[PDB]
Amino acid sequence: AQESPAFIDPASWNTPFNGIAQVACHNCYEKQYANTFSSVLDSVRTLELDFWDQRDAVSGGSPHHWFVRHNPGTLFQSGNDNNCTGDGTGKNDLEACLNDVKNWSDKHPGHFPITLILDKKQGWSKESSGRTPKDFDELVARVFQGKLFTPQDLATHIGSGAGALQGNLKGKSWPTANDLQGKVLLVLNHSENQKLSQYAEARTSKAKVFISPVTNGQNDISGKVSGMSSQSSGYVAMNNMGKGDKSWAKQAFAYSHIGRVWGDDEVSFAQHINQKINLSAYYRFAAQSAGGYRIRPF
Ligand SMILES: [Ca+2]
């Protein structure tokens, strides 16, 4: 039984995922934007977590653990400042926030696929510190288990190697929202494409997470991506654009890469749909809609 909340246009279900436009949150883990992280799923199906290795900028990390907060430092002695389960006791870490999504998914069989933007704020560790790309994949896999849909799954769907998604996606359809019912898609962002390139080089076709580089030219979609190796560029199936770079969403769309645009809150959802944006990130997500919908086909 496919879910039927009013904000989903039912035409979405038989549309390839790359042909669907969504209202997404921007930084909805912050208390100012929602009372609980779980509540965000009352309004949208694309969420975001900002995650840190250390308790402040320089200290306090532990293996196989990351903190969730906006700023390099917080007055909360826990190193967490967010609306996930544990908010009020300091136990509201990345794993807790991921578990909020997992638990919501278990309670809503047949849900529209959930996309989580994981906005990484520090560099990767080496093996001894327990926060490598492999450790990150192990965490997300432990939490979500078989809920995940990964780059290799997409590559199989389109008949490509995962390291040739970049160009082989052009002209192809992702699975439909119906095909993806009950699934979770994880996306890695960082201000520096080098950290995405480090992730992809480490994980290759085993990656649990889609990389989505900062995009401000054609080459960041289909060429040697700024800040990345050739190898890492080939795994790109998603692209991340700030407001000033949103014209590139039309080329993400052309390449069947999932484009996200953030920072463009004064522009309507309907306008963003005309601009071929898959994921339009809004701080005030519940206030956005087009003809009553927050998810609809282009
Ligand atoms: Ca963010």
PDB file of C-alpha atoms and ligand atoms in Angstrom:
ATOM      1  CA  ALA A   1       0.000   0.000   0.000  1.00  0.00           C
ATOM      2  CA  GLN A   2       1.584   3.202  -1.263  1.00  0.00           C
ATOM      3  CA  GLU A   3       1.219   6.096   1.151  1.00  0.00           C
ATOM      4  CA  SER A   4      -1.099   9.001   0.235  1.00  0.00           C
ATOM      5  CA  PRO A   5      -0.354  12.200   2.136  1.00  0.00           C
ATOM      6  CA  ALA A   6      -1.932  15.265   0.524  1.00  0.00           C
ATOM      7  CA  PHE A   7       1.392  16.912  -0.335  1.00  0.00           C
ATOM      8  CA  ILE A   8       2.375  14.166  -2.781  1.00  0.00           C
ATOM      9  CA  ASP A   9       0.907  14.545  -6.320  1.00  0.00           C
ATOM     10  CA  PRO A  10      -0.150  10.943  -7.102  1.00  0.00           C
ATOM     11  CA  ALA A  11       1.297  11.256 -10.631  1.00  0.00           C
ATOM     12  CA  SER A  12       4.668  11.113  -8.900  1.00  0.00           C
ATOM     13  CA  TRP A  13       4.482   7.376  -8.207  1.00  0.00           C
ATOM     14  CA  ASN A  14       4.902   6.216 -11.820  1.00  0.00           C
ATOM     15  CA  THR A  15       7.513   8.893 -12.583  1.00  0.00           C
ATOM     16  CA  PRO A  16      11.260   8.117 -12.584  1.00  0.00           C
ATOM     17  CA  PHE A  17      12.887   9.599  -9.469  1.00  0.00           C
ATOM     18  CA  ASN A  18      14.929  12.027 -11.657  1.00  0.00           C
ATOM     19  CA  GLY A  19      11.657  13.353 -13.143  1.00  0.00           C
ATOM     20  CA  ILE A  20      10.223  14.348  -9.726  1.00  0.00           C
ATOM     21  CA  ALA A  21      10.506  17.832  -8.183  1.00  0.00           C
ATOM     22  CA  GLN A  22      10.444  18.137  -4.406  1.00  0.00           C
ATOM     23  CA  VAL A  23      10.383  20.706  -1.699  1.00  0.00           C
ATOM     24  CA  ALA A  24      13.318  19.789   0.563  1.00  0.00           C
ATOM     25  CA  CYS A  25      14.293  21.102   3.930  1.00  0.00           C
ATOM     26  CA  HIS A  26      17.370  23.217   4.544  1.00  0.00           C
ATOM     27  CA  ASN A  27      19.096  22.332   7.853  1.00  0.00           C
ATOM     28  CA  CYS A  28      15.867  20.969   9.324  1.00  0.00           C
ATOM     29  CA  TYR A  29      17.823  19.289  12.159  1.00  0.00           C
ATOM     30  CA  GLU A  30      17.946  22.767  13.779  1.00  0.00           C
ATOM     31  CA  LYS A  31      15.397  23.409  16.545  1.00  0.00           C
ATOM     32  CA  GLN A  32      14.440  26.745  14.985  1.00  0.00           C
ATOM     33  CA  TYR A  33      13.052  24.953  11.858  1.00  0.00           C
ATOM     34  CA  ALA A  34      11.196  21.996  13.451  1.00  0.00           C
ATOM     35  CA  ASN A  35      10.296  20.743  16.930  1.00  0.00           C
ATOM     36  CA  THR A  36      11.562  17.265  16.187  1.00  0.00           C
ATOM     37  CA  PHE A  37      13.554  15.808  13.284  1.00  0.00           C
ATOM     38  CA  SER A  38      10.835  13.129  12.813  1.00  0.00           C
ATOM     39  CA  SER A  39       8.124  15.802  12.421  1.00  0.00           C
ATOM     40  CA  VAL A  40       9.795  17.069   9.211  1.00  0.00           C
ATOM     41  CA  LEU A  41       8.449  13.895   7.553  1.00  0.00           C
ATOM     42  CA  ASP A  42       4.915  15.246   8.103  1.00  0.00           C
ATOM     43  CA  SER A  43       5.670  17.763   5.293  1.00  0.00           C
ATOM     44  CA  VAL A  44       8.521  16.549   2.999  1.00  0.00           C
ATOM     45  CA  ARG A  45      10.564  13.497   2.006  1.00  0.00           C
ATOM     46  CA  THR A  46      14.024  15.154   1.716  1.00  0.00           C
ATOM     47  CA  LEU A  47      15.824  16.044   4.963  1.00  0.00           C
ATOM     48  CA  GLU A  48      19.305  17.312   5.976  1.00  0.00           C
ATOM     49  CA  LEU A  49      21.872  16.707   8.734  1.00  0.00           C
ATOM     50  CA  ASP A  50      25.106  18.703   9.298  1.00  0.00           C
ATOM     51  CA  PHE A  51      27.674  16.385  10.866  1.00  0.00           C
ATOM     52  CA  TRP A  52      30.962  16.950  12.666  1.00  0.00           C
ATOM     53  CA  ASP A  53      33.809  14.612  13.670  1.00  0.00           C
ATOM     54  CA  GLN A  54      34.674  16.516  16.815  1.00  0.00           C
ATOM     55  CA  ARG A  55      32.799  18.018  19.829  1.00  0.00           C
ATOM     56  CA  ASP A  56      34.273  21.364  18.926  1.00  0.00           C
ATOM     57  CA  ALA A  57      36.554  22.199  15.942  1.00  0.00           C
ATOM     58  CA  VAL A  58      39.626  20.426  17.327  1.00  0.00           C
ATOM     59  CA  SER A  59      38.756  17.869  19.993  1.00  0.00           C
ATOM     60  CA  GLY A  60      36.375  15.345  21.454  1.00  0.00           C
ATOM     61  CA  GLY A  61      35.787  12.843  18.675  1.00  0.00           C
ATOM     62  CA  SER A  62      35.288   9.120  19.217  1.00  0.00           C
ATOM     63  CA  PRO A  63      35.360   6.121  16.834  1.00  0.00           C
ATOM     64  CA  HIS A  64      32.332   5.275  14.715  1.00  0.00           C
ATOM     65  CA  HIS A  65      30.532   8.417  15.940  1.00  0.00           C
ATOM     66  CA  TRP A  66      29.702  11.865  14.592  1.00  0.00           C
ATOM     67  CA  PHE A  67      27.970  14.878  16.145  1.00  0.00           C
ATOM     68  CA  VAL A  68      25.071  16.876  14.606  1.00  0.00           C
ATOM     69  CA  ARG A  69      25.053  20.671  14.947  1.00  0.00           C
ATOM     70  CA  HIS A  70      25.331  23.817  12.817  1.00  0.00           C
ATOM     71  CA  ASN A  71      28.328  25.635  14.256  1.00  0.00           C
ATOM     72  CA  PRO A  72      31.971  24.583  14.892  1.00  0.00           C
ATOM     73  CA  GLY A  73      31.245  25.022  18.550  1.00  0.00           C
ATOM     74  CA  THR A  74      28.127  24.872  20.669  1.00  0.00           C
ATOM     75  CA  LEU A  75      27.322  25.902  24.232  1.00  0.00           C
ATOM     76  CA  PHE A  76      25.693  22.418  24.604  1.00  0.00           C
ATOM     77  CA  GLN A  77      28.419  20.468  26.341  1.00  0.00           C
ATOM     78  CA  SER A  78      27.419  17.332  24.406  1.00  0.00           C
ATOM     79  CA  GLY A  79      28.626  18.728  21.046  1.00  0.00           C
ATOM     80  CA  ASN A  80      25.099  18.102  19.643  1.00  0.00           C
ATOM     81  CA  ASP A  81      22.569  20.874  18.940  1.00  0.00           C
ATOM     82  CA  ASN A  82      19.597  19.492  17.082  1.00  0.00           C
ATOM     83  CA  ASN A  83      16.001  18.309  17.255  1.00  0.00           C
ATOM     84  CA  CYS A  84      16.675  14.549  17.008  1.00  0.00           C
ATOM     85  CA  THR A  85      15.753  11.985  19.669  1.00  0.00           C
ATOM     86  CA  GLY A  86      17.965  12.561  22.690  1.00  0.00           C
ATOM     87  CA  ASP A  87      17.615  16.425  22.395  1.00  0.00           C
ATOM     88  CA  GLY A  88      17.769  17.408  26.100  1.00  0.00           C
ATOM     89  CA  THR A  89      20.324  14.760  27.174  1.00  0.00           C
ATOM     90  CA  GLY A  90      23.173  15.201  24.714  1.00  0.00           C
ATOM     91  CA  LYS A  91      22.767  11.648  23.218  1.00  0.00           C
ATOM     92  CA  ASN A  92      21.338  13.097  20.002  1.00  0.00           C
ATOM     93  CA  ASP A  93      24.223  12.284  17.717  1.00  0.00           C
ATOM     94  CA  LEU A  94      24.350  11.371  14.031  1.00  0.00           C
ATOM     95  CA  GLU A  95      23.335   7.787  14.769  1.00  0.00           C
ATOM     96  CA  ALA A  96      20.325   9.010  16.771  1.00  0.00           C
ATOM     97  CA  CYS A  97      19.200  11.281  13.927  1.00  0.00           C
ATOM     98  CA  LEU A  98      19.570   8.435  11.396  1.00  0.00           C
ATOM     99  CA  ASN A  99      17.576   6.186  13.692  1.00  0.00           C
ATOM    100  CA  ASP A 100      14.748   8.761  13.783  1.00  0.00           C
ATOM    101  CA  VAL A 101      14.448   8.361   9.974  1.00  0.00           C
ATOM    102  CA  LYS A 102      14.783   4.572  10.172  1.00  0.00           C
ATOM    103  CA  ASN A 103      12.072   4.353  12.809  1.00  0.00           C
ATOM    104  CA  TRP A 104       9.737   6.673  10.856  1.00  0.00           C
ATOM    105  CA  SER A 105      10.305   4.443   7.780  1.00  0.00           C
ATOM    106  CA  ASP A 106       9.406   1.257   9.768  1.00  0.00           C
ATOM    107  CA  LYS A 107       6.143   2.846  10.906  1.00  0.00           C
ATOM    108  CA  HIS A 108       5.202   3.959   7.352  1.00  0.00           C
ATOM    109  CA  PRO A 109       5.476   0.971   4.988  1.00  0.00           C
ATOM    110  CA  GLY A 110       5.033   2.010   1.322  1.00  0.00           C
ATOM    111  CA  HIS A 111       6.461   5.479   1.883  1.00  0.00           C
ATOM    112  CA  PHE A 112       7.754   7.675  -0.931  1.00  0.00           C
ATOM    113  CA  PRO A 113      11.553   7.292  -0.947  1.00  0.00           C
ATOM    114  CA  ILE A 114      13.345   9.396   1.643  1.00  0.00           C
ATOM    115  CA  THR A 115      16.446  11.333   0.621  1.00  0.00           C
ATOM    116  CA  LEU A 116      18.856  12.411   3.412  1.00  0.00           C
ATOM    117  CA  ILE A 117      21.434  15.101   2.676  1.00  0.00           C
ATOM    118  CA  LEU A 118      24.439  14.437   4.891  1.00  0.00           C
ATOM    119  CA  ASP A 119      26.378  17.701   4.915  1.00  0.00           C
ATOM    120  CA  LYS A 120      29.838  16.859   6.206  1.00  0.00           C
ATOM    121  CA  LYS A 121      31.622  19.685   8.046  1.00  0.00           C
ATOM    122  CA  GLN A 122      35.138  18.328   8.735  1.00  0.00           C
ATOM    123  CA  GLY A 123      37.629  16.070   6.970  1.00  0.00           C
ATOM    124  CA  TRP A 124      37.871  12.310   7.026  1.00  0.00           C
ATOM    125  CA  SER A 125      39.969  10.590   9.708  1.00  0.00           C
ATOM    126  CA  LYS A 126      42.521   7.882   9.183  1.00  0.00           C
ATOM    127  CA  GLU A 127      41.764   4.281  10.145  1.00  0.00           C
ATOM    128  CA  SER A 128      42.976   4.521  13.758  1.00  0.00           C
ATOM    129  CA  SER A 129      40.409   7.215  14.657  1.00  0.00           C
ATOM    130  CA  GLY A 130      37.466   5.260  13.312  1.00  0.00           C
ATOM    131  CA  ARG A 131      35.852   7.902  11.066  1.00  0.00           C
ATOM    132  CA  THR A 132      37.026   6.850   7.620  1.00  0.00           C
ATOM    133  CA  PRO A 133      34.734   6.566   4.585  1.00  0.00           C
ATOM    134  CA  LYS A 134      34.461   2.832   5.372  1.00  0.00           C
ATOM    135  CA  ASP A 135      33.450   3.560   8.987  1.00  0.00           C
ATOM    136  CA  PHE A 136      30.820   6.014   7.715  1.00  0.00           C
ATOM    137  CA  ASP A 137      29.406   3.390   5.342  1.00  0.00           C
ATOM    138  CA  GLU A 138      29.400   0.846   8.176  1.00  0.00           C
ATOM    139  CA  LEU A 139      27.360   3.196  10.395  1.00  0.00           C
ATOM    140  CA  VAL A 140      24.773   4.012   7.780  1.00  0.00           C
ATOM    141  CA  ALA A 141      24.455   0.346   6.774  1.00  0.00           C
ATOM    142  CA  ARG A 142      24.058  -0.749  10.404  1.00  0.00           C
ATOM    143  CA  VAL A 143      21.223   1.760  10.861  1.00  0.00           C
ATOM    144  CA  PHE A 144      19.318   1.391   7.596  1.00  0.00           C
ATOM    145  CA  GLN A 145      20.223  -2.131   6.545  1.00  0.00           C
ATOM    146  CA  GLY A 146      18.232  -3.149   3.440  1.00  0.00           C
ATOM    147  CA  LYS A 147      16.377   0.201   3.233  1.00  0.00           C
ATOM    148  CA  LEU A 148      19.219   1.769   1.293  1.00  0.00           C
ATOM    149  CA  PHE A 149      19.262   2.395  -2.447  1.00  0.00           C
ATOM    150  CA  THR A 150      22.900   3.043  -3.462  1.00  0.00           C
ATOM    151  CA  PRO A 151      24.933   4.152  -6.491  1.00  0.00           C
ATOM    152  CA  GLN A 152      25.574   0.484  -7.451  1.00  0.00           C
ATOM    153  CA  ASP A 153      21.816  -0.170  -7.368  1.00  0.00           C
ATOM    154  CA  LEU A 154      21.283   2.705  -9.771  1.00  0.00           C
ATOM    155  CA  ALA A 155      24.150   1.516 -11.973  1.00  0.00           C
ATOM    156  CA  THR A 156      22.591  -1.945 -12.247  1.00  0.00           C
ATOM    157  CA  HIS A 157      19.207  -0.391 -13.153  1.00  0.00           C
ATOM    158  CA  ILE A 158      20.729   1.524 -16.069  1.00  0.00           C
ATOM    159  CA  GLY A 159      23.188  -1.216 -17.165  1.00  0.00           C
ATOM    160  CA  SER A 160      26.367   0.744 -16.259  1.00  0.00           C
ATOM    161  CA  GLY A 161      29.400   0.316 -14.029  1.00  0.00           C
ATOM    162  CA  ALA A 162      29.004   2.517 -10.941  1.00  0.00           C
ATOM    163  CA  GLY A 163      32.169   4.400 -11.944  1.00  0.00           C
ATOM    164  CA  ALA A 164      30.493   5.413 -15.241  1.00  0.00           C
ATOM    165  CA  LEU A 165      27.242   6.752 -13.800  1.00  0.00           C
ATOM    166  CA  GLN A 166      28.366  10.303 -14.605  1.00  0.00           C
ATOM    167  CA  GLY A 167      27.959  10.009 -18.347  1.00  0.00           C
ATOM    168  CA  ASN A 168      25.894   6.843 -18.692  1.00  0.00           C
ATOM    169  CA  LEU A 169      22.962   8.389 -16.838  1.00  0.00           C
ATOM    170  CA  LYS A 170      22.367  10.785 -19.752  1.00  0.00           C
ATOM    171  CA  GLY A 171      19.210   9.627 -21.503  1.00  0.00           C
ATOM    172  CA  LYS A 172      18.306   7.174 -18.730  1.00  0.00           C
ATOM    173  CA  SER A 173      15.589   6.923 -16.110  1.00  0.00           C
ATOM    174  CA  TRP A 174      16.095   6.235 -12.432  1.00  0.00           C
ATOM    175  CA  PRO A 175      13.662   3.759 -10.871  1.00  0.00           C
ATOM    176  CA  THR A 176      10.224   5.268 -10.248  1.00  0.00           C
ATOM    177  CA  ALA A 177       9.006   6.480  -6.852  1.00  0.00           C
ATOM    178  CA  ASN A 178       6.822   3.330  -6.806  1.00  0.00           C
ATOM    179  CA  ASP A 179       9.883   1.126  -7.472  1.00  0.00           C
ATOM    180  CA  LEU A 180      11.556   2.954  -4.552  1.00  0.00           C
ATOM    181  CA  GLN A 181       8.783   2.699  -1.996  1.00  0.00           C
ATOM    182  CA  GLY A 182      10.217   2.164   1.500  1.00  0.00           C
ATOM    183  CA  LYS A 183      13.743   3.116   0.423  1.00  0.00           C
ATOM    184  CA  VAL A 184      16.267   5.580   1.752  1.00  0.00           C
ATOM    185  CA  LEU A 185      18.822   7.395  -0.423  1.00  0.00           C
ATOM    186  CA  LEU A 186      21.847   8.996   1.291  1.00  0.00           C
ATOM    187  CA  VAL A 187      23.704  11.934  -0.209  1.00  0.00           C
ATOM    188  CA  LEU A 188      27.102  13.358   0.773  1.00  0.00           C
ATOM    189  CA  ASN A 189      27.769  17.097   0.605  1.00  0.00           C
ATOM    190  CA  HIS A 190      30.831  19.085   1.730  1.00  0.00           C
ATOM    191  CA  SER A 191      32.084  22.597   0.948  1.00  0.00           C
ATOM    192  CA  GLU A 192      35.226  21.023  -0.608  1.00  0.00           C
ATOM    193  CA  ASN A 193      34.731  18.534  -3.466  1.00  0.00           C
ATOM    194  CA  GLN A 194      38.088  16.950  -2.407  1.00  0.00           C
ATOM    195  CA  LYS A 195      36.325  15.274   0.523  1.00  0.00           C
ATOM    196  CA  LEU A 196      33.779  13.739  -1.853  1.00  0.00           C
ATOM    197  CA  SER A 197      36.627  12.590  -4.076  1.00  0.00           C
ATOM    198  CA  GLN A 198      38.294  10.962  -1.065  1.00  0.00           C
ATOM    199  CA  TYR A 199      35.057   9.157  -0.228  1.00  0.00           C
ATOM    200  CA  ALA A 200      34.531   7.846  -3.751  1.00  0.00           C
ATOM    201  CA  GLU A 201      38.137   6.735  -4.203  1.00  0.00           C
ATOM    202  CA  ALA A 202      37.921   4.819  -0.917  1.00  0.00           C
ATOM    203  CA  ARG A 203      34.546   3.165  -1.455  1.00  0.00           C
ATOM    204  CA  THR A 204      34.192   2.865  -5.269  1.00  0.00           C
ATOM    205  CA  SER A 205      31.250   0.592  -6.199  1.00  0.00           C
ATOM    206  CA  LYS A 206      30.679  -0.452  -2.579  1.00  0.00           C
ATOM    207  CA  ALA A 207      29.639   3.091  -1.606  1.00  0.00           C
ATOM    208  CA  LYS A 208      26.474   3.350   0.501  1.00  0.00           C
ATOM    209  CA  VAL A 209      26.155   7.093  -0.236  1.00  0.00           C
ATOM    210  CA  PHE A 210      25.771   9.181  -3.429  1.00  0.00           C
ATOM    211  CA  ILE A 211      28.313  11.993  -3.759  1.00  0.00           C
ATOM    212  CA  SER A 212      26.919  15.357  -4.847  1.00  0.00           C
ATOM    213  CA  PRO A 213      29.655  17.853  -5.691  1.00  0.00           C
ATOM    214  CA  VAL A 214      29.483  21.604  -5.447  1.00  0.00           C
ATOM    215  CA  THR A 215      28.526  22.571  -9.032  1.00  0.00           C
ATOM    216  CA  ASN A 216      29.192  25.840 -10.835  1.00  0.00           C
ATOM    217  CA  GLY A 217      30.070  24.799 -14.368  1.00  0.00           C
ATOM    218  CA  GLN A 218      29.327  22.069 -16.892  1.00  0.00           C
ATOM    219  CA  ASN A 219      32.473  20.123 -15.987  1.00  0.00           C
ATOM    220  CA  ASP A 220      31.119  19.584 -12.441  1.00  0.00           C
ATOM    221  CA  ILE A 221      28.249  17.603 -14.032  1.00  0.00           C
ATOM    222  CA  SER A 222      29.913  15.797 -16.937  1.00  0.00           C
ATOM    223  CA  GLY A 223      33.633  16.537 -16.928  1.00  0.00           C
ATOM    224  CA  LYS A 224      36.573  16.290 -14.563  1.00  0.00           C
ATOM    225  CA  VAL A 225      34.783  17.770 -11.554  1.00  0.00           C
ATOM    226  CA  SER A 226      36.432  20.690  -9.784  1.00  0.00           C
ATOM    227  CA  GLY A 227      38.444  19.394  -6.873  1.00  0.00           C
ATOM    228  CA  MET A 228      38.076  15.715  -7.779  1.00  0.00           C
ATOM    229  CA  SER A 229      39.971  12.986  -9.635  1.00  0.00           C
ATOM    230  CA  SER A 230      38.791  11.480 -12.896  1.00  0.00           C
ATOM    231  CA  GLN A 231      37.914   8.289 -11.013  1.00  0.00           C
ATOM    232  CA  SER A 232      35.695  10.120  -8.530  1.00  0.00           C
ATOM    233  CA  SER A 233      34.074  12.229 -11.230  1.00  0.00           C
ATOM    234  CA  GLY A 234      32.740   9.062 -12.871  1.00  0.00           C
ATOM    235  CA  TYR A 235      30.557   8.243  -9.828  1.00  0.00           C
ATOM    236  CA  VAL A 236      28.667  11.551  -9.932  1.00  0.00           C
ATOM    237  CA  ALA A 237      24.889  11.014 -10.147  1.00  0.00           C
ATOM    238  CA  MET A 238      23.860  14.106  -8.128  1.00  0.00           C
ATOM    239  CA  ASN A 239      24.845  17.786  -8.063  1.00  0.00           C
ATOM    240  CA  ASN A 240      24.724  20.490  -5.348  1.00  0.00           C
ATOM    241  CA  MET A 241      24.093  24.153  -6.282  1.00  0.00           C
ATOM    242  CA  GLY A 242      23.872  27.338  -4.286  1.00  0.00           C
ATOM    243  CA  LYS A 243      21.492  30.135  -5.408  1.00  0.00           C
ATOM    244  CA  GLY A 244      24.004  31.790  -7.750  1.00  0.00           C
ATOM    245  CA  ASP A 245      24.621  28.440  -9.498  1.00  0.00           C
ATOM    246  CA  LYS A 246      21.003  27.216  -9.950  1.00  0.00           C
ATOM    247  CA  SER A 247      21.041  27.559 -13.775  1.00  0.00           C
ATOM    248  CA  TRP A 248      23.162  24.360 -13.737  1.00  0.00           C
ATOM    249  CA  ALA A 249      20.100  22.362 -12.534  1.00  0.00           C
ATOM    250  CA  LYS A 250      18.874  22.264 -16.144  1.00  0.00           C
ATOM    251  CA  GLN A 251      22.075  20.380 -17.037  1.00  0.00           C
ATOM    252  CA  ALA A 252      21.789  18.059 -14.040  1.00  0.00           C
ATOM    253  CA  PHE A 253      18.283  17.356 -15.366  1.00  0.00           C
ATOM    254  CA  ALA A 254      19.677  16.773 -18.874  1.00  0.00           C
ATOM    255  CA  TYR A 255      22.181  14.246 -17.455  1.00  0.00           C
ATOM    256  CA  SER A 256      19.625  12.538 -15.176  1.00  0.00           C
ATOM    257  CA  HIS A 257      21.612  13.633 -12.112  1.00  0.00           C
ATOM    258  CA  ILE A 258      19.564  14.642  -9.067  1.00  0.00           C
ATOM    259  CA  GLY A 259      20.055  18.382  -8.594  1.00  0.00           C
ATOM    260  CA  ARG A 260      19.631  20.197  -5.312  1.00  0.00           C
ATOM    261  CA  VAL A 261      19.471  23.982  -5.027  1.00  0.00           C
ATOM    262  CA  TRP A 262      19.871  25.688  -1.645  1.00  0.00           C
ATOM    263  CA  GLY A 263      19.774  29.335  -0.546  1.00  0.00           C
ATOM    264  CA  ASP A 264      17.022  30.346  -2.959  1.00  0.00           C
ATOM    265  CA  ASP A 265      14.168  30.689  -0.490  1.00  0.00           C
ATOM    266  CA  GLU A 266      12.569  33.842  -2.019  1.00  0.00           C
ATOM    267  CA  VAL A 267      11.790  31.890  -5.197  1.00  0.00           C
ATOM    268  CA  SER A 268       8.624  29.767  -5.339  1.00  0.00           C
ATOM    269  CA  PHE A 269       8.394  26.008  -5.720  1.00  0.00           C
ATOM    270  CA  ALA A 270       6.538  26.418  -9.074  1.00  0.00           C
ATOM    271  CA  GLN A 271       9.399  28.608 -10.419  1.00  0.00           C
ATOM    272  CA  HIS A 272      11.954  25.992  -9.243  1.00  0.00           C
ATOM    273  CA  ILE A 273      10.053  23.292 -11.025  1.00  0.00           C
ATOM    274  CA  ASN A 274      10.284  25.344 -14.258  1.00  0.00           C
ATOM    275  CA  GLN A 275      14.035  25.693 -13.572  1.00  0.00           C
ATOM    276  CA  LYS A 276      14.301  21.786 -13.580  1.00  0.00           C
ATOM    277  CA  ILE A 277      15.363  21.511  -9.936  1.00  0.00           C
ATOM    278  CA  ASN A 278      14.808  18.085  -8.331  1.00  0.00           C
ATOM    279  CA  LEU A 279      15.347  19.155  -4.682  1.00  0.00           C
ATOM    280  CA  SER A 280      14.551  22.780  -3.730  1.00  0.00           C
ATOM    281  CA  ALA A 281      15.882  23.310  -0.204  1.00  0.00           C
ATOM    282  CA  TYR A 282      13.856  25.721   1.980  1.00  0.00           C
ATOM    283  CA  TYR A 283      14.349  26.683   5.608  1.00  0.00           C
ATOM    284  CA  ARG A 284      10.555  27.185   5.817  1.00  0.00           C
ATOM    285  CA  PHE A 285       9.624  23.992   3.897  1.00  0.00           C
ATOM    286  CA  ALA A 286       6.021  23.578   5.123  1.00  0.00           C
ATOM    287  CA  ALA A 287       5.093  27.032   3.719  1.00  0.00           C
ATOM    288  CA  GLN A 288       6.037  25.940   0.155  1.00  0.00           C
ATOM    289  CA  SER A 289       3.831  24.223  -2.349  1.00  0.00           C
ATOM    290  CA  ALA A 290       2.660  24.339  -5.931  1.00  0.00           C
ATOM    291  CA  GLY A 291      -1.066  23.706  -6.459  1.00  0.00           C
ATOM    292  CA  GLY A 292      -1.209  22.147  -2.996  1.00  0.00           C
ATOM    293  CA  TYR A 293       1.759  19.792  -3.572  1.00  0.00           C
ATOM    294  CA  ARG A 294       5.328  19.573  -2.292  1.00  0.00           C
ATOM    295  CA  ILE A 295       6.231  16.579  -4.489  1.00  0.00           C
ATOM    296  CA  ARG A 296       5.188  16.465  -8.195  1.00  0.00           C
ATOM    297  CA  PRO A 297       6.545  15.563 -11.655  1.00  0.00           C
ATOM    298  CA  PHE A 298       8.098  18.258 -13.754  1.00  0.00           C
TER     299      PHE A 298
HETATM  300 CA    CA B   1      23.729  22.078   5.726  1.00  0.00          CA
END
